[PDB]
Nucleic acid binder design. Structure first.
Length: 298
DNA sequence: CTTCAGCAGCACGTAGGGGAGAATTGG
RNA sequence: CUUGCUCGGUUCGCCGAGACUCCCCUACGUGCUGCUGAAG
DNA sequence: CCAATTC
């Protein structure tokens, strides 16, 4: 299940004011700082509407509006498994420690010597009762079935300065027959360069790639990022994820690249089939500005 | 003005916790 | 094989060779440096 | 149609 990466193009507001991220942050902050008894007291986080509703009242965690059971479940199981996992880490060493102590004691008993004393344990709780190596908050925003990427159809999605695509039409191809371009137009290969061009099948880089306009010791062309990007989203494929009043729109060109180098798909493929190769629950990075996808089992 | 000694990391590892849905269903 | 990333050739028009299991977190070595004390 | 249920 390899991962595939995708860049963002627009969003309503920064992914920090989202109810999902705020609720996950509050839940984590509450759970990580629990005592080894309060963990078992508040560990009956439910799976239904009523159980997950009454847990928030019992534990008092602020709720910013988020109520999705599928979206409130993915940010409680992870938090409690991380809490339990730190204890699992501090108790993993003690298993081999006890095994080694038992082996040494058995060897001494066989030799006749009395068993040697060993350290009891290295627990994870200090005088305050809380946990020593308290975990850090995960900024990842995990998606779910109810909110899955779909083709950006402007029928209901809001008005953006973007283009539109047919989910049924096959995906466009990257300027076939490169050596037919008028002079003075983007992508033009001068005549001296046409001899000794690559004949093997490889990635077809676009004119407005960032690798062709970048600072380099022997590159005298001037970098114009403002135009290099403003003329780069015209040929973009837009996929949209939507939780509430939020409308992340992405670029399904990373997905298109991903499907073409693991022996998966060819130029004859519609948008619906493109993201039908991927799991419907991507992971979002609020600070880096990237979305991560995963293939299916096939 | 040389050896140490218990701490911190702009950076590199490592080591070990956690994680990365969808099909059947109900107002 | 349209975005993204790495390394390069160029008349600067874009050309070539690549990698693609990723993220988060708490610890912990290393020179670097800082903070003290022994040593003629 | 689209939030909630088990797996």
């Amino acid at each position: 299940c390899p991962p595939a990466k995708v860049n963002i193009l627009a969003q309503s507001r920064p992914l920090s004011e989202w109810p999902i991220n705020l609720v996950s942050k509050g839940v984590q902050e509450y759970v990580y700082g629990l005592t080894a008894a309060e963990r078992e007291a508040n560990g009956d986080f439910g799976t239904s509407r009523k159980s997950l509703d009454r847990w928030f009242a019992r534990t008092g965690v602020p709720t910013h509006g988020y109520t999705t059971v599928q979206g409130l479940n993915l940010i409680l199981r992870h938090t409690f498994n991380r809490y339990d996992g730190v204890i699992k880490k501090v108790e993993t060493r003690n298993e081999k420690r006890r095994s080694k102590a038992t082996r040494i004691n058995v060897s001494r008993e066989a030799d006749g010597l009395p068993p040697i004393e060993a350290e009891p344990e290295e627990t994870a709780f200090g005088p305050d009762g809380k946990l020593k190596e308290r975990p850090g908050i995960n900024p990842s925003i995990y998606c779910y079935q109810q909110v899955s990427p779909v083709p950006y159809n402007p029928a209901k999605h809001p008005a953006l300065p973007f283009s539109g695509v047919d989910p049924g039409a096959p995906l466009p191809l990257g300027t076939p027959n490169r050596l037919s371009i008028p002079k003075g137009q983007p992508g033009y290969v001068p005549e001296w360069q046409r001899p000794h061009l690559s004949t093997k099948n490889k990635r077809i880089r676009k004119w407005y790639a960032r690798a062709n306009w970048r600072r380099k010791p022997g590159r005298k062309s001037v970098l114009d990022e403002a135009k290099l990007k403003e003329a780069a989203l015209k040929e973009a494929i837009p996929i949209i994820v939507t939780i509430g009043k939020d409308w992340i729109v992405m670029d399904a060109r990373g997905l298109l690249r991903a499907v073409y180098w693991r022996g998966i798909a060819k130029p004859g493929l519609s948008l619906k089939e493109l993201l039908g190769f991927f799991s419907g629950d991507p992971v979002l990075d609020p600070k880096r500005g990237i979305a991560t996808f995963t293939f299916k089992l096939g």
